[PDB]
Structures are given as structure tokens and as C-alpha cells.
């Protein structure tokens, strides 16, 4: 284990490899990754030609956390803050073979509630399998966007916010034994 890239990427020449938190790694790690951006081939520790030829390689760095850390900074008072953090942290030999650098912004509240809409509908298909129905309301969706988002980590713990705040109280139906032919449950937690 280690050298497992044979069973992954020359098993699948059409693949997508994600390098999460590349800013944490050592310099010597991506000196060996300079091959695969130039050539598309990699030399394994067991002597294989691990082709990265059709693989969409994607590197990842949250080199941006300044605004993220509250609307304050190091001064006495976005997109280009994390661009020059890559230049500060990495070597320019590594960054320029990469095709496009994609920067993500802070999500607007109207952008978050659409993600809430997409993910509340994922469990709703498993409710009408048992002829249950979460009657959807938009007042609860705004509170899920408040609780399931922070500007350091947000829209990743949104799904745990769904299962802790909705799905905990929908287990209270069968705790007090609500099955029937089907119960049209509507939940709204208090305002914050």
C-alpha cells in the first residue's frame, strides 16, 4: 500500500485525481508531480508507467482564510488574495504547467438556500417510499442556511445540519408511534 496508483489510474486512464490540501504537503512530494504535468507519465516505486494522460488532475488549497476569518484582517482598515498566496507558498515551476486556476467566492444567502433545496429533496424520495411526506416550507430552509453555513467551512456541514435538525425530530414520529397510512409532517424550529 503506497504505490497503489497502478490499481487506480492505469486501471482507469479516464479518471479524476483530487489532491486535497496540497499546501500541507512537502516540497519533494510535488517535485515528483512535475513529471505528470509535463509528460503525463509517472514512475512508480515498483517500476510502472502510471499514465496520467487522460486524467483531469485537480489540486486543492484553502490558501485563503483571511476574510474567511471574520470581516477583519492584519490592517487598521478576495479572489486575488488567494492567488498570491499560491505564489507565496509554492514554487512557480509547479503552478504554470497547471491549466486553469479556479477561485471560489463566499456564497450568497440566495446561493446557499438552493443547495438546501437540492439536499432536502434527496431524503424526500426516501420518505414517500414509506408514504411519508415532509411538507416543504421555506421558513425552515432559511434557518438551515443560517445554521449549516460558516465562512470557514460552510456548505459541507449543511448535510449534518439536515440530519441533526430535521431527521432527529422525524424519528420522534415513530417514538410516539406515528405510522398510519401516512402522516403529513411539517416542522419548524424556533427563530434565531
Amino acid at each position: 500500500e503506497g504505490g497503489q496508483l497502478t490499481e487506480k489510474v492505469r486501471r482507469k486512464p479516464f479518471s479524476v485525481v483530487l489532491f486535497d490540501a496540497i499546501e500541507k504537503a512537502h516540497q519533494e512530494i510535488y517535485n515528483s508531480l512535475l513529471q505528470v504535468l509535463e509528460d503525463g507519465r509517472l514512475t512508480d516505486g515498483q517500476g510502472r508507467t502510471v499514465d496520467f494522460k487522460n486524467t483531469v488532475l485537480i489540486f486543492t488549497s484553502n490558501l485563503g482564510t483571511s476574510d474567511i476569518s471574520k470581516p477583519v484582517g492584519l490592517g487598521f482598515s478576495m479572489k486575488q488574495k488567494v492567488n498570491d498566496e499560491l505564489k507565496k507558498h509554492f514554487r512557480p515551476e509547479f503552478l504554470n504547467r497547471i491549466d486553469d486556476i479556479i477561485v471560489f467566492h463566499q456564497l450568497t444567502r440566495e446561493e446557499i438556500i438552493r443547495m438546501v433545496d437540492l439536499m432536502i429533496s434527496r431524503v424526500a424520495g426516501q420518505l414517500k417510499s414509506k408514504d411519508m411526506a415532509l411538507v416543504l416550507t421555506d421558513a425552515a430552509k432559511a434557518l438551515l442556511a443560517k445554521r449549516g453555513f460558516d465562512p470557514v467551512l460552510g456548505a459541507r456541514p449543511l448535510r449534518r445540519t439536515i440530519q441533526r435538525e430535521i431527521e432527529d425530530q422525524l424519528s420522534e414520529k415513530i417514538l410516539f408511534e406515528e405510522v398510519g397510512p401516512g402522516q403529513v409532517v411539517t416542522v419548524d424550529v424556533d427563530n434565531w
Binding site: 483571511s66 476569518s69 471574520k70 477583519v72 484582517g73 492584519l74 490592517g75 487598521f76
Partner: protein
């Protein structure tokens, strides 16, 4: 390195004579700890003999600027500019060790500055508004009338930490934790 581990645990150590270079270090440290975590309290340890009014109000404004609460702890001495910085902590978080000394006194020219009387009417109007600003600052932070502080800082007013609590310079005299 023990000053690094103070600063990694968000403790700015004043320590020396408040001059320009000491004020420049703390404002660099107040804003970095503002940027590292603006919601976590900066602690400021004060063992200073004071000095400097523009260096005072450089440290004073910066520790009032930052989002973080400043926990001022007087170690053995807070004199002149440093006792104002000691009162400059957030209310409820101004601390002093039991045998720490708080020395409040009006601003003073260290050494004579020469000049024409028109030059000296301005250097005297400057130390007068240095004096009123020292008293207006120390009245916002001690809850006194700023004419009371003018009567009190007429001379050198040495405060023990128990009577710097009664004066309003600090809020808590620190109790010992020797588990013994």
C-alpha cells in the same frame, strides 16, 4: 522560546519602557493577533515604567481598535503611560498581581525644550492637551469625573493593586494558584 509561546497563546508582553520602538512592536502584535482570531481575547502583560504619550496613544488606540478583548495584567509596575494602558483593557478583564504597583501621574517633559515664547505656548498647549487626553482616557476606563483624576494625578499617585481596583484602574486582583 518563551516570548514566542506567550505570543502563540495570544499574550502580548509589554515589558519595557514605552517608547516609539516598544509601541511599534505591540501594534504589530495587536493586529496580528487580531488577524489570527479576532474573537479570542488578547492578553497584554504590563511591567512597564511608562513614558511617551504618542507611544501611549499608539498602543492605546490599537488595543481599542482590535475586535479582540484586551486582558491587561499588571505584573510588577504600570507607571505613567503603562497605567493608562492597564486601564485600557476591556472592563472585567483588567487584572493586576497582588504586589503590582500602579503609578498614575500627569504628563511631563523629560528635559527642557528651548524656544521662543510663541514656540513654548504651543509646547505647553500640547502638554495641556496631553494632560486632558490622559485624564479623559483614564476617566472612560475608571469611571471617574476626569477632574478627580486631575486632582489625583497632580502628583505621582502610586496605587497598590487592591487600591487600583478601588480606583478603577484594574478590575480584579489576581489570586494565587500554587496548588499548595
Amino acid at each position: 522560546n518563551p516570548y514566542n509561546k506567550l505570543f502563540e497563546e495570544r499574550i502580548i508582553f509589554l515589558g519595557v519602557q514605552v517608547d516609539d520602538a516598544s509601541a511599534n512592536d505591540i501594534m504589530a502584535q495587536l493586529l496580528v493577533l487580531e488577524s489570527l482570531d479576532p474573537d479570542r481575547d488578547i492578553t497584554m502583560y504590563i511591567n512597564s515604567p511608562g513614558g511617551g504619550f504618542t507611544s501611549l496613544m499608539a498602543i492605546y488606540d490599537t488595543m481599542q481598535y482590535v475586535r479582540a478583548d484586551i486582558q491587561t495584567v499588571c505584573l510588577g509596575q504600570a507607571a505613567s503611560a503603562a497605567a493608562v494602558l492597564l486601564a485600557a483593557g476591556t472592563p472585567g478583564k483588567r487584572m493586576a498581581l497582588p504586589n503590582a504597583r500602579v503609578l498614575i501621574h500627569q504628563p511631563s517633559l523629560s528635559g527642557v525644550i528651548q524656544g521662543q515664547f510663541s514656540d513654548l505656548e504651543i509646547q505647553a498647549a500640547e502638554i495641556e492637551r496631553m494632560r486632558t487626553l490622559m485624564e479623559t482616557t483614564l476617566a472612560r476606563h475608571t469611571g471617574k469625573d476626569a477632574g478627580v483624576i486631575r486632582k489625583d494625578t497632580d502628583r505621582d499617585k502610586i496605587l497598590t493593586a487592591e487600591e487600583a481596583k478601588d480606583y478603577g484602574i484594574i478590575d480584579t486582583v489576581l489570586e494565587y494558584r500554587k496548588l499548595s
